[PDB]
Design a protein around this ligand. Structure first.
Ligand SMILES: NC(=O)c1cccc2c1C(=O)N(C1CCNCC1)C2
Length: 350
């Protein structure tokens, strides 16, 4: 039986839940009879991205239908859905390819996880929890409730959570210190770079095995650019309110996970509107999307050299911005050092 702590073990069970995988799929209207979990493939997901990019181009050009129809059939041939009747939705706009792409991102992480939860020696010497834990290649330690670290984190979560979107309330059930294998010697060279901050990154639970196992990644070339406001990179927030929205929780499954990463921002290229870049200006090492709301700068705290902007949310200088919350994008996976992972309960006000 595992020597790990209940909170950690329970974390393993969460990120490796098959049901959750089939749930996220069925929720996507994916036919589990035509496309069961095991059938999922990386190549297949690549091809699908490519089709979606062709649709974007078609949509942008103003393709004379049929071609927009043939591309739609193609995508639904690759990704088997069950509509029954009324026919599948036509992918003929930005909105459609955007959503279809977000799903492929998720489906990708599910394949990564299922491929892991099914790979390796499935013997009976070590217990399932221990085996799986290893597959993650991540050191997971529980952070004491009554500790300076926990105190800080809880304050960061409490302050950056407001009422203008008070559709729910946040409860920190567990906080873990995390250190992925490799993520250290890879980040080292970037630590010798100013503007290092502790930012948020929320994601569906089903994507966490792939995140811990392979770290946060950047969309592939084949992936359509629509949706990525500031190009293909890694996105973070300084307010749990913006990040917590990517955990996609509901009163049905009120529990989600959210990361806390130390990001070497360097000199930030500040923008107020979407802008595909990837290629920053000389001297710029990241992008900062200016939001209408920022954490009170006077409340900024630090440690080790990492700034924690846990100050309560105030109104930034600019409202001429399209963004409501700030956004931080880095285009090099090594500019990120994941530090903590939180298990949070979302209490919806309804
Ligand atoms: N994940 C986060 O915490 C997060 C935080 C801030 C902004 C964004 C994300 C995120 O994931 N964003 C997506 C990027 C891909 N295109 C859809 C939107 C934008």
């Amino acid at each position: 039986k595992s020597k790990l702590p209940k909170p950690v073990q329970d974390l393993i069970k969460m990120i490796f839940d098959v049901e959750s995988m089939k749930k996220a799929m069925v929720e996507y209207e994916i036919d589990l009879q035509k496309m069961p979990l095991g059938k999922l493939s990386k190549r297949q997901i690549q091809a699908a991205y490519s089709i979606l990019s062709e649709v974007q181009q078609a949509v942008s050009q103003g393709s004379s239908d049929s071609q927009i129809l043939d591309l739609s059939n193609r995508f639904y041939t690759l990704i088997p859905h069950d509509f029954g009747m009324k026919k599948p939705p036509l992918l003929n706009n930005a909105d459609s390819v955007q959503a279809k792409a977000e799903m492929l991102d998720n489906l990708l992480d599910i394949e990564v996880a299922y491929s892991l939860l099914r790979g390796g020696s499935d013997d009976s010497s070590k217990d399932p929890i221990d085996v799986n834990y290893e597959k993650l290649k991540t050191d997971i330690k529980v952070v004491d409730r009554d500790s300076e670290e926990a105190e800080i984190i809880r304050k960061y979560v409490k302050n950056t959570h407001a009422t203008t979107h008070n559709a729910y309330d946040l409860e920190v059930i567990d906080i873990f210190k995390i250190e992925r294998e490799g993520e250290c010697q890879r980040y080292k060279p970037f630590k010798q770079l100013h503007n290092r901050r502790l930012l948020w990154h929320g994601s569906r639970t089903t994507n966490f095995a792939g995140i811990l196992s392979q770290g946060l990644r950047i969309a592939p070339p084949e992936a359509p650019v629509t949706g990525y406001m500031f190009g293909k990179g890694i996105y973070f927030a300084d307010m749990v309110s913006k990040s917590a929205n990517y955990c996609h929780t509901s009163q049905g499954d009120p529990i989600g996970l959210i990361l806390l990463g130390e990001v070497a921002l360097g000199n930030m290229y500040e923008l107020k509107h979407a802008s595909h870049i990837s290629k920053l200006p000389k001297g710029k090492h990241s992008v900062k999307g200016l939001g209408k709301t920022t954490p009170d700068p006077s409340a900024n705290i630090s440690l080790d050299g990492v700034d924690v902007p846990l100050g309560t949310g105030i109104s930034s200088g600019v409202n001429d911005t399209s963004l409501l919350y700030n956004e931080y994008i880095v285009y090099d996976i090594a500019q990120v050092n994941l530090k903590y992972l939180l298990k949070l309960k979302f209490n919806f006000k309804t």
